[PDB]
Amino acid sequence: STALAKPQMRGLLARRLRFHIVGAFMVSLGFATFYKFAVAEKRKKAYADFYRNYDSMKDFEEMRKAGIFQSAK
Amino acid sequence: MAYPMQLGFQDATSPIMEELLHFHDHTLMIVFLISSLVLYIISLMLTTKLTHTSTMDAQEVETIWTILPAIILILIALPSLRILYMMDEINNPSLTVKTMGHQWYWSYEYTDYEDLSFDSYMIPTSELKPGELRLLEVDNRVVLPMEMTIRMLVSSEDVLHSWAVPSLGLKTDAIPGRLNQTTLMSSRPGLYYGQCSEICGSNHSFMPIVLELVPLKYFEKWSASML
Amino acid sequence: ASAAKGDHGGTGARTWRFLTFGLALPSVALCTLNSWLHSGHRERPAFIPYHHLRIRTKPFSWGDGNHTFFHNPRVNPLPTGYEK
Amino acid sequence: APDFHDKYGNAVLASGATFCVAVWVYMATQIGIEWNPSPVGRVTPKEWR
Amino acid sequence: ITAKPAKTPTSPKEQAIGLSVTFLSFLLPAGWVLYHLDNYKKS
Amino acid sequence: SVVKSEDYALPSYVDRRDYPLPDVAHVKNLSASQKALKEKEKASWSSLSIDEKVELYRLKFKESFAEMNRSTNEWKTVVGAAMFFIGFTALLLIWEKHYVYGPIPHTFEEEWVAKQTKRMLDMKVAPIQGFSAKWDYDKNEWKK
Amino acid sequence: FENRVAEKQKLFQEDNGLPVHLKGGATDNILYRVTMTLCLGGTLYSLYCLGWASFPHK
């Protein structure tokens, strides 16, 4: 036989809380990172890429030839 | 216009609409994060058999939970108000167009040089031509020059309406006795739709707005042909 | 501002009666003279059918629908002008 | 003594799930509802003008 | 909370009756109007 | 024993794990043998049998901690019944479609949708991300 | 005038189980019935007027 060692007995709820609030913070940072990357940055880059060499007269000509306008045939 | 199953805003047609989309993305992350933190903390409080039911001291923790929200609000308000003062900045329009709301259709007046004005009514569903959009098309579109700063002035001759074009970030109420101004600048040619946005009686759902954005010289000839 | 009047050191009804007959009713008697002095009819102005006046968006619920509740023929024109 | 949930819990869970799935699938696919999904990857564009 | 057993127990069958009558009381009158809408309108 | 409605203002018994020693005993009236067992409890507890100890416990308390904390199968009934009534709702929606809704507009016919889709692409609806962005104007097909 | 409040105090305090709105005697009953008949009658009349006004007159 052998005695069982004394385990921690005090502040168990506070300890679990401390551990998980920090966990929740770390997650929030790792979500913020992913969200900036998958949504916000992606959007900025879609708009910057679209307009970089965008030719509005050429876009207009394609629309006009497709017959979409009242004012331009 | 909106497309089926759409989740977010219509793509931006104007730089101020572009600004709103990035400011929405910023704000929504925050919304995402706070809601998730709350849902998570809730599940954390509810998933243990350990208890602590005696009186708990509140002062320390209330500082965190006042100061961090205050900071998050200032991080939303700084860019929010930058954009607000941006839209308000002086910009020198090249053209002024008026629109008057009516039950139930919009009229347009372009009177910088000639007396050009006309009415703009929804195309009835039984008269749509194949490919045209139910409740959105009009008989006479609001033709305007692309890539130019336009002053739109909005009022009504009867009850309230409101003149909106979501892809340009626009919504200005149409109030009789009042002349409200907004500015419009499209980065691109094309057709940009909106719908009356103040309850105005039996056909509120059925008086839409269609802008037709084209090069200046096409706009001038169209203006002349509409006299 | 104390006013220019001046007391305390006891109290009450006798002082407020002194104020009622010594100050308040004299002021009413004075304003009553002043008023009944600038009284009696002033010349009614030319009628002009201004559209922000004599509003009628629905008949009144009394009379012929076109007279205001305490209509005074001498000084209140109708939408079409002073009465005959 | 077993209560209501011990005696009938499994059957209530099994049958309510089977029934719920069956009637939603049917309502969603068999009675002419137009969900109007995105055309993207689904519709071949056709000449309109 | 604790409480006494029911003074007037409502058996599974009686609950089925109360539930059905309660659902019918909402469903039938509205159903009758909505079924006859075309009659009210293109009247 | 028997709790009465007209005893509401008196201290009462409760099993709950955060109030382990309730304000009164579960059983206060004692039979002849139960009175003899309460006298025996004044002497050494080593001389009580296991059954006598369990009888003293059940005079003082109603349920043990393991009894009062036990888990139940109630969740099956709740989730199953909720799914039933959600399933019942789809019956109402089938009835509504069959007897209340008429034909939806002609703009949802397949050929209309094809033409409207081409016309939305010809006017480059949402050309940055939302709609026309997903069309390949070089290969004339939906982007992969 | 003379102060007859003590007489009203005895009247309103008489132990006859009457609620205060009827404790003054038979005139309270009359004024109560007149009030309630005009209220309930006027309410039926207001319903009649709704039924009338709920349909076009033409």
Next chain:
Amino acid sequence: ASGGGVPTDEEQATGLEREVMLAARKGQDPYNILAPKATSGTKEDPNLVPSITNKRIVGCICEEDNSTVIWFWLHKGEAQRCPSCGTHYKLVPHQLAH
């Protein structure tokens, strides 16, 4: 300037208003207008709780400024203790003719 003719409460108050005015004149509080002052609350010196029946609700504000009040019925008999702070209360029934 002045004269009389206005009855006083002594002459004309009646009913409950009069009972309260007459009891207050004697330093008494049969209608519970004042808050009772606590004793030290020990078993030898319990708070004495008057009542006209066989039980009365006590609220115990255990420490000054606690926002939480602890409520329980106090019955005729042996002193009882507040279940949060233990201070002692004892019911003293009777009459309304105290």
Next chain:
Amino acid sequence: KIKNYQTAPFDSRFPNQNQTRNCWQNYLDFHRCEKAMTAKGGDVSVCEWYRRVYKSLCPISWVSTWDDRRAEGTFPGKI
């Protein structure tokens, strides 16, 4: 003086979304000017700017209503 008029310029007197008083003030200014001209024998062409600005800004129905009321003798603004 300043032709190639495109539209009414920004006016720091009326910098906000509500432009009703901009239209009204230009309509007034035009008609006041025109009365001051023609009267003193001078030329209405000097009032042209106000005329262009109110034409640009004002709804046709406001102008038309105000013109009718000036004719009827019921225009409430001072000219």
Next chain:
Amino acid sequence: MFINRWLFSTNHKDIGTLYLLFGAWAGMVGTALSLLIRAELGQPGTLLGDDQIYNVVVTAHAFVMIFFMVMPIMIGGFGNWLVPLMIGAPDMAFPRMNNMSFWLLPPSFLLLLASSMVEAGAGTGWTVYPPLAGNLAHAGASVDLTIFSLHLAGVSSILGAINFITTIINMKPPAMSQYQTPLFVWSVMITAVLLLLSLPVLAAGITMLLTDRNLNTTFFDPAGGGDPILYQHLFWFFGHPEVYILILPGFGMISHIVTYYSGKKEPFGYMGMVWAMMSIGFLGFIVWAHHMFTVGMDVDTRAYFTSATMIIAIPTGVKVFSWLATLHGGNIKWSPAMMWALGFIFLFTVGGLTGIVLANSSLDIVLHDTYYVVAHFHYVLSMGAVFAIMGGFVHWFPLFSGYTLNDTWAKIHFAIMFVGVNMTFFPQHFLGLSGMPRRYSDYPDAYTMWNTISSMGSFISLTAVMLMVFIIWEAFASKREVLTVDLTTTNLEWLNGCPPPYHTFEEPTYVNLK
């Protein structure tokens, strides 16, 4: 005996029960109107008729849910039942005037149902803006009947508010300060101060509308020098405080229900919760023009209303985090009332956060008058005020009736309602961001998918509302009588038994000062 007891009541419990019955009946009317809305929108095209009949239905939906369901249940029903018992008072200060607050409601509701019966109804929106609500675009009696319905409801709540303030300030035990009253009592007092100051302003604005429609005044008619926008300011000077009036007694019940089912003797941070409710009541009077960001106001005025509106998130967050800290360490009892309160905490937080989105004027330009606003406010009303009401009703039903509910059925009811209201409102965020307007009887075809799903959601909530009526019938049919209740030392309203006698606290509690 019947008429003396139930038409001539001066008893706070019975009049509380009258308000509960009236609010439950109103709730079945507001539920039917909400299903007519979602039947119209549940497929593309026109079901009922054009926007007139449709917005008559939309307008009545809102007035019935707000004035005849939520305010009567929370303040008339739970406020009258609980407030006197929670302070040991023998009744309200003005028990007879209290009964007139109740009886003015059936006539107010009758006027509202008359408005919809005569002419073509009042299809104006619950904001009743002119000129659409004036005598040319809404000729005839409907809108004046709606104005009068609002006058009667306004008087009923103004006299109610006087009664609650007076009772709460004046009828506590002499040892109890206001910082020893429970949070639900603070929430009713604060809400009653908001009613007292805001209702007379709405009464003034709708009276002006009445005289513009019938006495040839021109408060809101530019032909006489009036301004339609002035009506909007007077209405929303009331209408913002009104949404805090609809939620505050819900926050007070949530604090009680969370504390009780966490097995705690008190809510976390009591004086912080008091401070938070008074700050939100105060800030709720200086923000109203966030309902008018597209009307053409000046830029600095839109900057101030954006910022002052956002600030309300601070005291509101204190309450949400304090409810979380109250669960923390609790011996959690997963009762059906607890589930309603946990649903409240999370879904109110979602709708408060979309409110924060909307406080941003530059973004609100594009979101205003679209379904994004509709999603915001149904998360705080159908999943906040309603969840607090169903949580408090299942919690206190055994006190009011003496009978228990079947907890399994009540959990099933909570599960069906939770799925149905999220299915109904969650997709309206997408409809609003992509630009679908409010108050429309039909939509362009692209909006079909989310409207169909939202309409399917509303039917699942209809099944929950029908099952709730059955669950209440079951409890009265089986008559399981309450025996003991936990934690009475910190929930005084239970200590007189279930139901309490008609007169309680005839002998007041004993509370010493020390």
Next chain:
Amino acid sequence: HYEEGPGKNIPFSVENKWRLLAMMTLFFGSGFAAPFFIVRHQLLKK
């Protein structure tokens, strides 16, 4: 006095569950049916 106790502090009777079911059906049922009949009324008129 008035009756006190479970089932007696309410303006409706719960002495018989079936008669109760009828009254509750009429009560909630009339509130839920009313807006459908008003809509029917507004359609019939014109």
Next chain:
Amino acid sequence: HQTHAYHMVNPSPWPLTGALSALLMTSGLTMWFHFNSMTLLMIGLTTNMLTMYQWWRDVIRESTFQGHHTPAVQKGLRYGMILFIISEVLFFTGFFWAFYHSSLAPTPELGGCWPPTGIHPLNPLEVPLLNTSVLLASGVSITWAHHSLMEGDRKHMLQALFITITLGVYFTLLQASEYYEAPFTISDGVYGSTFFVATGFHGLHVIIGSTFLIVCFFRQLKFHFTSNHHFGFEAAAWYWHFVDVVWLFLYVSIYWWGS
């Protein structure tokens, strides 16, 4: 038997009759405005008058005759009366807001000026200043009445209260005469709308306060008040000061500043 000081009121029909009178007055104004008939409205005004009369009669029975107004009951009624006055102050604030909104930013229809083109305001130094002196004087004479009552002086209480009521009536007759003589009407745009609706609600409150002082005058004649207990008189004095302060704000805002 209770051993608290609060008043359990006997069951009463007046809350239901007052609620029904409100339905009858509002459905009556509706029938008057739209169906050309005064019948419902006269029945509602009558039931409303009967309801107030019997309800306040009963409060006098409960207090003066039955003794239920202990100090704790009176203190409640003080709060009740203060809160009711606050709600009436907010009701007037909505009309003052309407007045300032329209006058501070006069629209083009008015001529873009205040007072509008075509409006000839009353001279504020004539009958309006007289009305101001009249209500201020009546706030001095009610204060005299209040102190005589506290000092036990029946005759001077009645004399000062009579004077206060006579000034209320004089203001009401002077106002009725100025309404008749005024060359503008309630249909004269937003100037006539704000003028008549704001001064007209104020005149109604002067009539209500004068009625209330008349009720106090007859109770005083019947000896109901003691030198220390007379809450009906204090409430009517607070309500009367309220009506005088609302007049002062109307005089400064609408008659003076808005002329």
Next chain:
Amino acid sequence: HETDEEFDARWVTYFNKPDIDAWELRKGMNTLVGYDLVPEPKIIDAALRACRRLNDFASAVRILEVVKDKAGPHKEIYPYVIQELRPTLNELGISTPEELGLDKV
């Protein structure tokens, strides 16, 4: 304020009071289990001996159940506390809940 050792010492002394009464025994255990801790063996030992002076065997057993319950999912805590109490359990003849079958659901 106080060390863990001082907290424990005050509780030991509370339950060691010779003439502790039944009400004080319940008040002490029902307050103590409100804290964020499982009570040390020496506190429980003194509460069990108070049970003995008050001739209450059942409450000694219930105290052992509440120790196990306050440990939540830390299943190593209760067996350690029983090991530390065995000399007192044997000396007082206290059976554990498990030895009585009262751990069975």
